[model samples]
Target: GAPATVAEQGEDITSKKDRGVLKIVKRVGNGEETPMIGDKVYVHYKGKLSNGKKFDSSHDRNEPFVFSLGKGQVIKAWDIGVATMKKGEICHLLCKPEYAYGSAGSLPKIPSNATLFFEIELLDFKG
Candidate 1:
């Protein structure tokens, strides 16, 4: 099935520009503290292509994903986006190909130069 266009999925989405990249969707959070560089973060996330075809999801596995912030432990978009979030918060990350899998892509799953979409939730973190 074909995915709906961005306009069809409406919300109070806004954009933030960085290094020529823009984050196009967002939701506010209420956590007391945000994750910082070197902090170990636990999160639940769903990843999809621009077509809205899901590629990965921690929720499906019934476990959270873990990684260190700003450590290049994940994609550039994830590092940047997740860093801006707080524990127990969730946001959408709409990333350009350069900030995601890039020109070569992940292959066998993600296609080349694909724009990526992610719904990420910050479950916990430890500095």
Candidate 2:
């Protein structure tokens, strides 16, 4: 199968402005505590390109990735999408080039203006 169907992947949770960064929740988080600025959020992610190629995965690394919410530590899509995530939430975030690697793209794995599909699972978050 090709890269297609966000509606089929999960529930659409994309925000009003960041439409380029699409958020689709596959599994709901346990609670309502979303992250705010300065809080460290831990997540596990499996990334792929529109070609359905596995580009990267935190699960392979044997550790969850951590970053501060509202910070520019990661991609624009992640900054917006993960901000709304609660602990234990799993989501499939479809990131356009603008919110992802952009026209420049990441080296080796990503191509120019590649659309990225990320399976993000929020493990925990804290201030």
Candidate 3:
């Protein structure tokens, strides 16, 4: 099933520029509506390429990704993506080249300038 809105469709497509990457599909709940400089959050995520090739997934790993937003624990794209979500909220995000691995990609599966997709669930937050 395809997404309903333009934003939702955008979430499924990565951007050529980093600023346009990771469009917000749906926002759930209403806490910060986004994280600040320092906020701890537990999230479940599924990451893949445009071709539906999965690279990483907390669900597949049978675990959740726990990190502090804007604390430099992960990629800039992930930080931005998770910040826009609230507890128990789910969102689909698209990551651009710069926001991803850039020139030196993750290797093996990911290629340079390849964008990425992510379905993330904001589970909890401790700020």
Candidate 4:
């Protein structure tokens, strides 16, 4: 049977600097539309820890988060993964320890040396 979830399959984009780290799976993708650097991007996201527990979810609050590109406002993977997504697209980012909080977990809910998954939807963007 085909894997039911997009998370099961993706083109790992961590090939550049991070190599074999960040993976971006597209649940929904638009045409060749991409945001520019410094564009404020809006997204709804659900973050799950390796233990299969949800650590955070913006969708639950019914409010999209915003972070401009060319900035480290979010996690390393969020900046990298979101850049690979097109507007109106939703992506699942699989992040290894290095791309996140690393071996020392900072957040109370997320554990140390954890792997994380984030389902992020790019609503829109503007400068």
Candidate lDDT (C-alpha), each: 0.74, 0.82, 0.71, 0.76
Q: Which stretches of candidate 4 lie over 4 Å from their true place?
A: 1-9, 15-20, 24-26
List, residue by residue over 2-35, the lDDT tens digit for candidate 1. 2233323423222444331333334556656798
Q: Which of 2 and 4 is the better model by lDDT?
A: 2
Kindly report which residue pairs in candidate 1 clash with one another: none
Candidate topping lDDT = 2
TM-score on alpha carbons, each prediction = 0.80, 0.88, 0.78, 0.84
Estimate, for each residue in 1-127, the C-alpha lDDT of model 3 and write its tens digit: 1322333545433334424454665556566565666888888888888777888899776898988788778876777777666677887777767777787887887887777877888878887
**Predicted structure 3: lDDT:** 0.71
- Candidate 4 lDDT (Cα, whole model)? 0.76
Candidate 3: clashing pairs of residues:
22-94
Model 1 spans with C-alpha error above 4 angstroms: 1-27
lDDT of 4 by residue, 31-95 (tens): 77778778899998988886668899997889999989858888788887888888888876778
Candidate 2, residues 1-127, lDDT tens digits: the string is 2236663453344565545776667788987878898899999999998888899999787899989888799997888889878889998887789888889998899999998999999999998
Which has the better lDDT: candidate 3, or candidate 4? 4
Q: What is the full ranking by TM-score, best candidate first?
A: 2, 4, 1, 3
